Amino acid sequence: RDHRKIGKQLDLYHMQEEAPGMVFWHNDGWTIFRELEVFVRSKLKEYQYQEVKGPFMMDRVLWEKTGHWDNYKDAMFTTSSENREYCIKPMNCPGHVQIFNQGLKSYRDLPLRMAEFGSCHRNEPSGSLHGLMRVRGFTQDDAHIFCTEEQIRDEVNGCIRLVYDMYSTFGFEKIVVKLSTRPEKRIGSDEMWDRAEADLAVALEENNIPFEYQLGEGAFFGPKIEFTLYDCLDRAWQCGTVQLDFSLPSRLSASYVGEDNERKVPVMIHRAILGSMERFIGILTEEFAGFFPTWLAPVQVVIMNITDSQSEYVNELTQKLSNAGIRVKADLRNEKIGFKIREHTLRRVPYMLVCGDKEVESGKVAVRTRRGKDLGSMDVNEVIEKLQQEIRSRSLKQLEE
Amino acid sequence: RDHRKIGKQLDLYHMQEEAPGMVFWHNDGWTIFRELEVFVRSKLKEYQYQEVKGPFMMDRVLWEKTGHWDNYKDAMFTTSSENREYCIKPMNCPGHVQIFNQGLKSYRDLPLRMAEFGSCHRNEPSGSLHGLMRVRGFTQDDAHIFCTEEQIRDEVNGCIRLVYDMYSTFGFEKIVVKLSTRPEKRIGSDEMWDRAEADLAVALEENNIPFEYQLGEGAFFGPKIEFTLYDCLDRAWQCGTVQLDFSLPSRLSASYVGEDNERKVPVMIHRAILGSMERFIGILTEEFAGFFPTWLAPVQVVIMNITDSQSEYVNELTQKLSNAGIRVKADLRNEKIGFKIREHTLRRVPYMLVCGDKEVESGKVAVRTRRGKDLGSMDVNEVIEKLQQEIRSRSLKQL
Ligand SMILES: Nc1ncnc2c1ncn2[C@@H]1O[C@H](COP(=O)(O)OP(=O)(O)OP(=O)(O)O)[C@@H](O)[C@H]1O
Ligand SMILES: Nc1ncnc2c1ncn2[C@@H]1O[C@H](COP(=O)(O)OP(=O)(O)OP(=O)(O)O)[C@@H](O)[C@H]1O
Ligand SMILES: [Mg+2]
Ligand SMILES: [Mg+2]
Ligand SMILES: [Mg+2]
Ligand SMILES: [Mg+2]
Ligand SMILES: [Zn+2]
Ligand SMILES: [Zn+2]
């Protein structure tokens, strides 16, 4: 049930000591990663987010200005060029503010929602590293919303709504919500912290979401709503996060022209829905025990012959399913079909299509699933249509399941 | 036609002194980048490439094994953690070999084609930096092909075919090819360099490609075919490249079980088709003067109302085009229609749809282009279909 064991069995990724906490994504794990990006992007479109890309590193001077240097230096990787020191970014917020700061902004531009699949590096103590769930290089499905104070309620509500909308696709039954309050080391006044923490609490109450406080776990610049998911040992992992920030835009000289023609500082909401792709894939792997929903499955269909007699027909069906957009592979090896089926079951391939002479003559396929079910013979075109529907709806459940 | 001025005018990206040579991709520039990735991914499905992702940093010891720490040192960003030294990767090859080395490989797995949109960082001298063309952090449409000696000819041919295939989509008329031979600092024996250089020259001749030698410009591990594209000032920029490598696989302990059941070392072909996304976008921006073909345009369609009476219709049209897969925006601002049209024309939006009362009553739309052509009233579904055909085919010219 451990995602590290399942990841090896399905050849999803590996890690090695030449790059501690750094993931090597193999083809099949990168397929899952990419499908999750496509899913997130479909939500970015619906909820009207920009998508940007900030640089990997920036001058230490800028990280000093935010307060990251004093409050985050231990976790930061640094490098140098031509007598200047750079920080590899542990967070995407300063880069998004650099983009916001190009060009004059008006209240008419707000709320401005700016998303990034943002690569973060944090020098986590090597003793704390754990598979995909705690790594040193990870990719957040991050975004920063620049808004007015009057827009905070609506924008925080929109993030909360987005979290439950995305999580319902995966069928999560245990989502534990925490409000992380001010940490001992922080910037911003007590009055600003009281306001930000109340805003989050009222937003959760308004959505009728039960939660508990988590004292001292907020960011150095603002409080957080945390959406907690659980692994196979029922350990709590922080995934989704909504953060309210009255401090960083001021520190980074962000402003916009208000209705009054006065210069104003935007509020910034930070949020990640999945958290990081790495930690979320870890959670999905354990939650599903490697039985990824068909739309996520690295290989959705394997087509297999009984003998070389049906090998041409298998090759035609494989091209046909591939042209219909299905991740399909042919298994033409000189092995018994029971052997093949057991192997692709261990690989958690949703569907196995067996082609005997009966199947070749009729243009049909015998359908087996990774759950051990025999689904009988079906017409090829009906199978394709059913798989396409299963994939496009991102269905959690297989045919006749 | 300088891509840096166009990039500012169209809000594609920016750069600043807090990160020399590092691009901040804005929404519209990042849209072009992502469409190029979609295009590349479509071609690699066709040619049966895997797609992977390696880590950003690995131990200095690994870069010593490859010979990079000695042949590539001062060009590399280095960092530390818990008394170990790491290199931010300047190339993707060692990571791809690490993935190849996971699990027993046989001749049945070859050729194994492994692609990555590989983020590279190189400490280029700050005085050499230029716009998007020469940056310190960039993304290569990289791949490594592991193959046998007998498979070299076919695999190099496939890379050359891929370059001309993908470049024809953009209509490039000037593609100059170079063969870069052994540099002063290299790994691998002279006989291996003789054979690698001959293999690439034969490949170019067999593909009917006139080329010029570039003595001493090969990679430290092997010679390269370089595909050169030219900017507005006719400066030469290396974009696509094919590199033949008989030495890195052995240094990194790559092997496969041959048909005879003995251990053998694969040959590696390195190749990038576009080169880097940053540099290729720079070239495209100058080549098209910011009039990106519709399939690449950050915003493909803007729909505007003349008065508030049509605002509802414009919103229904906008949702309909967006559901048909078109990058479309509604412009409902309290501005004169002639102000709105000019704004989106200057932003080089391919198609502008104007809705007055007669368009609403008829279920039609008045269509004009960024070049000033007035297409008149058209049926909505006719516009969507023509737009979809222009995008699906990645057509260079409009309606
Ligand atoms: N080391 C890490 N490995 C993997 N994912 C991470 C890591 N650190 C953070 N994330 C993910 O990024 C999200 C947003 O980042 P944030 O700065 O809020 O995390 P965090 O509070 O430091 O997390 P944690 O308490 O788990 O260390 C987290 O909710 C988590 O999903
Ligand atoms: N500093 C850079 N900025 C942008 N793109 C680059 C840069 N260096 C290399 N590339 C791109 O990556 C491709 C493959 O990398 P490779 O190591 O072969 O380049 P290169 O020979 O060092 O390039 P150049 O001669 O332009 O310095 C190049 O052909 C080019 O398109
Ligand atoms: Mg942390
Ligand atoms: Mg935390
Ligand atoms: Mg170079
Ligand atoms: Mg060169
Ligand atoms: Zn942030
Ligand atoms: Zn390489």
Residue numbers in the entry:
A (entry chain A): 242 to 642
B (entry chain B): 242 to 640
Share the article's original sentences.
Aminoacyl-tRNA synthetases (AARSs), a family of essential protein synthesis enzymes, are attractive targets for drug development. Here we present five unusual crystal structures showing that threonyl-tRNA synthetase (ThrRS) is covalently inhibited by a natural product, obafluorin (OB). OB contains a β-lactone ring with a 2,3-dihydroxybenzamidyl moiety attached to the α position and a 4-nitrobenzyl moiety attached to the β position. When ThrRS catalyzes tRNA aminoacylation, the Zn2+ ion recognizes and binds l-threonine, assisting in the l-threonine activation reaction.
To test the mutually exclusive effect between OB and ATP, we engineered a ThrRS_Y462F mutant that mutated Tyr462 to phenylalanine to avoid covalent bonding with OB. As a result, in the TSA experiment, OB only increased the Tm of ThrRS_Y462F by 2.6 °C, while 36j still increased the Tm of ThrRS_Y462F by 29.7 °C. Consistently, OB failed to inhibit the activity of ThrRS_Y462F in the ATP hydrolysis assay up to 5 μM. More interestingly, when we cocrystallized ThrRS_Y462F with OB and ATP, ATP was visible in the active site of ThrRS together with two cobound Mg2+ ions. No densities for OB were observed in the active center. Without the binding of OB, the conformation of Tyr313 of ThrRS_Y462F was in a position that would clash with OB as it was in the ThrRS-OB complexes. In addition, compared with the ThrRS_Y462F-ATP structure, OB induced a significant conformational change to the outer side of the active cleft, which was similar to that induced by another potent ThrRS inhibitor, borrelidin. Therefore, OB prevents ThrRS from binding to all three substrates, including l-threonine, tRNA, and ATP.
